[PDB]
Amino acid sequence: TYTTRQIGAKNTLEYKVYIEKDGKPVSAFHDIPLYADKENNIFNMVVEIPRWTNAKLEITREETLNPIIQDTKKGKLRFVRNCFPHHGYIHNYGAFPQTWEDPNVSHPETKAVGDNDPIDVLEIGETIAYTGQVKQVKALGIMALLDEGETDWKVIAIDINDPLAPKLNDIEDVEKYFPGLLRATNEWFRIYKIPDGKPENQFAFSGEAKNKKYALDIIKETHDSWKQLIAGKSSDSKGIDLTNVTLPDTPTYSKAASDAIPPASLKADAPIDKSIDKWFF
Amino acid sequence: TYTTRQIGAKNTLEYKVYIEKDGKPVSAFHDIPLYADKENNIFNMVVEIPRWTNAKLEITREETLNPIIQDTKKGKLRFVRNCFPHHGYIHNYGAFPQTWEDPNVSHPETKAVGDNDPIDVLEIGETIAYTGQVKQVKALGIMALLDEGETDWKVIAIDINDPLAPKLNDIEDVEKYFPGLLRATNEWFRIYKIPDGKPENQFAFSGEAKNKKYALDIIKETHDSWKQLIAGKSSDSKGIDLTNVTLPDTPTYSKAASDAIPPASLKADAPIDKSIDKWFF
Ligand SMILES: [Mg+2]
Ligand SMILES: [Mg+2]
Numbered sequence: 001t002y003t004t005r006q007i008g009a010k011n012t013l014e015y016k017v018y019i020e021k022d023g024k025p026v027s028a029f030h031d032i033p034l035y036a037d038k039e040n041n042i043f044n045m046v047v048e049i050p051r052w053t054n055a056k057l058e059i060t061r062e063e064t065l066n067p068i069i070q071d072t073k074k075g076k077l078r079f080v081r082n083c084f085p086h087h088g089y090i091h092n093y094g095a096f097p098q099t100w101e102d103p104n105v106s107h108p109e110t111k112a113v114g115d116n117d118p119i120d121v122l123e124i125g126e127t128i129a130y131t132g133q134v135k136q137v138k139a140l141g142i143m144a145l146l147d148e149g150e151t152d153w154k155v156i157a158i159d160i161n162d163p164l165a166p167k168l169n170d171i172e173d174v175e176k177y178f179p180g181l182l183r184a185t186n187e188w189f190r191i192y193k194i195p196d197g198k199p200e201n202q203f204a205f206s207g208e209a210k211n212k213k214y215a216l217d218i219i220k221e222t223h224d225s226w227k228q229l230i231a232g233k234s235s236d237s238k239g240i241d242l243t244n245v246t247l248p249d250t251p252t253y254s255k256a257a258s259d260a261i262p263p264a265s266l267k268a269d270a271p272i273d274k275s276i277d278k279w280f281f
Numbered sequence: 282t283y284t285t286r287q288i289g290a291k292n293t294l295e296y297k298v299y300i301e302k303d304g305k306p307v308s309a310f311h312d313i314p315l316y317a318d319k320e321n322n323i324f325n326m327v328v329e330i331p332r333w334t335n336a337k338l339e340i341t342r343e344e345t346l347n348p349i350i351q352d353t354k355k356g357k358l359r360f361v362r363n364c365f366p367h368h369g370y371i372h373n374y375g376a377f378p379q380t381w382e383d384p385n386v387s388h389p390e391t392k393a394v395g396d397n398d399p400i401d402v403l404e405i406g407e408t409i410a411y412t413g414q415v416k417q418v419k420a421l422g423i424m425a426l427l428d429e430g431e432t433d434w435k436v437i438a439i440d441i442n443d444p445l446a447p448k449l450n451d452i453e454d455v456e457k458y459f460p461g462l463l464r465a466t467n468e469w470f471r472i473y474k475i476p477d478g479k480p481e482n483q484f485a486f487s488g489e490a491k492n493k494k495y496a497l498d499i500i501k502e503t504h505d506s507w508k509q510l511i512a513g514k515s516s517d518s519k520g521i522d523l524t525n526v527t528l529p530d531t532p533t534y535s536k537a538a539s540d541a542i543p544p545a546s547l548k549a550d551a552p553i554d555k556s557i558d559k560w561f562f
Contacts, residue, residue: 051558052333052368085465087333087368126559179562184366277332278407281460 001032001044004132007067009267011055013077016067017132018261019046021246025261028059028132029066029118030230030244032097034223036136041216042160045121047133049093054079054276057131059095059118061240064257068131079272081195083188084281090181090188091122092129096155099222104235107151109218110204115150116238119222122154122185124178125162136160141171142215143182144204145189153218154189156182156209171211182209195280282313282325285413288348290548292336294358297348298413299542300327302527306542309340309413310347310399311511311525313378315504317417322497323441326402326418328410330374335360335557338412340376342398342521345538349413360553362476363560364469371462371469372403373410377436380503384431385516391425391485393432397521400503402436403466405459406443417441422452423496425485426470432485435470436496452492463490476561 002021008014018025019032026032028046036042048057048068056071056078063069071078080088101114123129123137137157145152158168164177175182186207190200210218228234230242232251242252283302289295299306300313307313309327317323329338329349337352337359344350352359363369382395404410404418418438426433437455439446445458455463467488471481509515511523513532523533 084459084461085366085371090366127555128558177562178365178560180365181562274408277409279459281458281462 001026001134004130005261005264006132006266007262008265010131010269011070011077011272012267012270013070013072016063016069017057018065018067019132019134024245024258025065025067026246026258027065027244028068029061029097029240030226030242031065031246032134034096034098034219040138042136042138043096043121043157043219045094045123045133045135045137045157046097046118047092047094047123047129047131047135049089050128050130051090051092052088052128054082054088054272056080061117061238064241064243065245065261066241079276080192081276082279083191083195084279086184086188090184091124094121094123094129095119096121096219096222098226098230099219100226100229101151101153101222102225102234103150103238109144110146110151112146112149112151114222114225115147115152116240118226119219120152120154121157123157123159124174124181125159125164127159127162129159138165138168139212139215139219140168140174141209141211142218143185143189143207143209146202146204147189148193148198148201153222154185155215155219156185169212171209174209282307282415285411286542286545287413288543288546290546291550292351292358292553293548293551294351294353296551297344297350298338299346299348300413300415305526306346306539307527308346308525309349310342310378310521311507311523312346312527313415315377315379315500323417323419324377324402324438324500326375326404326416326438327378327399328373328375328404328414328416329412330370331411332370332373332409333368335362335369335553337361340399345522345524346526346542347522360557361473362557364472364476365560365562367465367469367473371465372405375402375404375410376400377402377500377503379507379511380500381507381510382432382434382503383506383510383515386506388432391427391432393427393430393485395503395506396428396431396433399507400434400436400500402438404438404440405455405462406440406446408440408443410440419446419450420493420496420500421449421455422490422492423499424466424470424488424490427483427485434499435466436500437466437490450493452490455490466490 005018007016095118099119103116141156143154286299288297376399380400384395422437
């Protein structure tokens with residue numbers, strides 16, 4: 001829940017970022033609490049992709065302790081392209097740990113199976129985050145994205161330490177203080193894959209940002225799917241590595257899975273190919 | 282017209298970049314030829330600010346060999362803030378060398394004088410340029426901002442090496458291949474001071490980007506102004522250091538000025554304050 005272990009250089013096939021709790025790698029999927037404060041609904045967010053970057057960095061579902069590694073496409077690193085007027089991702093992009101978009105069941109809101117990942121979070125605060133960061137966020141609302149035909153909810157969140165956090169308590173506050181951001185988000189996740197030769201995505205509810213209560217309800221849903229999956233009780237865990245070092249009541253618990261992770265070998269960020277500069281229109 | 286030499290660490294009051302021709306520093310204002318190909322109107326552009334950065338960099342007209350440094354006001358380094366939905370600068374921002382906007386001369390359709398600087402160039406191509414880079418661009422059109430009694434033209438240009446450059450020749454082609462970029466340009470120059478406590482800027486021709494010929498006329502005007510300037514014939518070259526190392530009959534020729542320039546610095550970029558992350562709405 002605590003620090004970062006970087007293997008290799010950023011923008012490179014060798015790159016991994018493990019999350020450390022007390023110097024030791026924990027599973028970024030399973031081993032980080034959903035709640036930093038269940039009492040006040042403060043969540044733990046795992047940051048994957050800083051605002052205004054392109055490299056498609058993910059918690060890897062099939063790698064032990066699920067380090068963040070860059071996605072690849074036929075072997076080549078994957079970057080999201082710049083879709084005018086936007087530069088890379090327009091949110092600090094991450095996941096709530098201990099949640100799962102159930103791929104095996106059709107979700108009633110969207111009429112589709114889940115995308116088989118943690119539930120995604122758009123943290124809208126002013127400071128750009130870093131990969132591997134665990135931060136504390138509160139939920140403002142939620143958008144029902146169908147990303148390539150899979151239920152792919154996007155939680156709208158704000159860092160608890162953001163200057164604006166006190167003023168932001170529900171989704172109406174985001175339009176109030178961040179005018180046009182939600183419209184832009186609706187647009188961004190519709191179009192961000194056209195440059196890749198893929199179709200426009202879709203939203204349920206015409207892309208309406210559902211409120212905090214609705215967000216809490218859906219996060220709850222994805223948490224319970226995760227509790228089944230991590231219990232070994234999913235109909236299909238879809239090849240996910242459920243090795244964890246904090247949850248002893250689960251079949252795949254192993255404290256020294258941590259020990260077998262290589263030590264940090266941070267190198268300077270490799271250069272990104274110049275083509276990733278291009279602004280698509 | 283060749284390489285760069287950086288003195289200082291980037292994002293620092295000490296920071297300066299020089300253009301080198303074959304290892305040796307020349308004036309970025311005076312020694313880079315305006316035309317890379319006159320008869321075809323291919324100009325050499327001096328790039329000051331990469332697209333999607335914040336630091337307000339500029340050729341100094343008052344320093345010898347006129348290095349690119351960061352603007353300051355009352356001792357504080359100057360950055361442009363992030364104005365939604367824009368991230369920093371939305372063009373590669375540069376100037377044409379061997380041009381100058383005579384403050385002692387006035388336009389009538391744009392009732393306003395020179396701002397005493399080289400003409401500003403917005404290069405609209407896909408690759409993000411580097412500070413001090415000299416690229417070959419073609420002019421497509423020109424907008425006229427009206428900063429207090431002085432006409433601030435902005436040539437709209439594209440890199441000659443850009444994949445799209447053959448398809449682009451006049452201002453309507455920007456509307457064709459870069460839909461929305463013109464209105465963004467228009468919006469950005471209008472608001473980009475509002476976060477700095479300033480008013481909204483103000484366009485001539487009701488924000489109309491006039492065409493290639495209109496740009497060629499202006500550009501060629503400001504070269505003729507520079508010509509009388511460098512020849513020592515100018516009415517008022519207050520504050521302009523006209524030192525140059527390639528024009529051997531000018532009053533201000535001095536090869537030794539190249540020789541005087543410190544070696545390139547071995548300092549990593551200074552950190553930028555996280556307040557610059559902020560997205561302003
Ligand atoms: Mg997802
Ligand atoms: Mg100017």
